[PDB]
Design a protein around this ligand. Structure first.
Ligand code: PB
Lengths: 19, 254
């Protein structure tokens, strides 16, 4: 492990799912 | 491809292209189209309109050969799945009403991954069975499905952007020593098996993202989209950042 960058979760592509 | 004959199947297109077609068709509720999944092997994505908004449902191919939307009933094929949802929404925002059929002169877009896997399966069969001509042709048909996973999961090893042995330091040395154009990247394996690192340069600074595969065998950057193979991950991130500081552009060769 080390100093890895995190994902900007606010720019992730959203997929839909059944409700 | 089991869906190639469907008039509403667009092949390997992006979400953007899919939304463009639905818009040009009128944005009617229930308007839908089917495209090939860019993240999984043999999957599809159902793209539909409802309340002037787009909904994209990934369809996964189960091990037993059926297809299903996450948490939905499995179906024997993509056409049967669409037919079922036309009758019963069964979880969707609305039932499928009116397929967004491909405009005249438009054929489904061939997938790059499928195209590359073809060559790899041929080469694998040729090297292993030492066959050629019609013999090779028969064998590939018989072997293709069995060696499919094997070739797909290892396809990244043949790409320019993959470096079999690079430490973080060596990776930075390679990325920094060059044009340093935004999006320049490379993929390298890490010490612990099952983990890799995506290293890219953006604004004269190198970013490293951890990639690990879960219990399901899927790969992903922590809290990110999941892919069946490393090749699909890289190719997807070339189209959209999907959480990254910038999307992948130029591959940093060998
Ligand atoms: Pb091609």
């Amino acid at each position: 492990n080390q100093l890895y960058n995190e994902l900007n979760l606010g720019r992730r592509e959203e997929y839909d799912v059944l409700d | 491809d089991p869906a190639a004959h469907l008039p509403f199947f667009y092949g390997s297109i992006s979400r953007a292209e899919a939304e463009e077609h639905l818009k040009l068709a009128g944005m009617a509720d229930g308007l839908f189209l089917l495209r090939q999944c860019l993240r999984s092997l043999g999957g599809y994505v159902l793209s539909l309109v409802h309340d002037v908004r787009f909904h994209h449902f990934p369809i996964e191919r189960q091990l037993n050969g059926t297809y299903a939307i996450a948490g939905g009933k499995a179906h024997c094929g993509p056409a049967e799945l669409c037919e079922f949802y036309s009758r019963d929404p069964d979880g969707l925002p609305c039932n499928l009403r009116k397929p967004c059929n491909r405009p005249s002169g438009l054929e489904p877009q061939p997938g790059v991954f499928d195209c590359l896997r073809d060559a790899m399966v041929r080469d694998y069969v040729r090297q292993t069975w030492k066959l050629e001509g019609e013999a090779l042709e028969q064998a590939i048909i018989s072997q293709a499905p069995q060696v499919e996973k094997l070739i797909a999961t290892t396809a990244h090893e043949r790409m320019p952007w993959y470096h079999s042995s690079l430490t973080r330091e060596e990776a930075e040395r390679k990325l920094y020593s060059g044009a340093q154009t935004d999006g320049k990247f490379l993929l390298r394996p890490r010490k612990e098996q099952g983990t890799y690192a995506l290293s890219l340069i953006y604004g004269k600074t190198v970013y490293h993202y951890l990639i690990s595969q879960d219990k399901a065998g899927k790969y992903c950057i922590p809290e990110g989209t999941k892919f069946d193979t490393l090749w699909q991950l890289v190719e997807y991130l070339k189209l959209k950042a999907d959480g990254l500081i910038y999307c992948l552009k130029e591959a940093c060769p060998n």
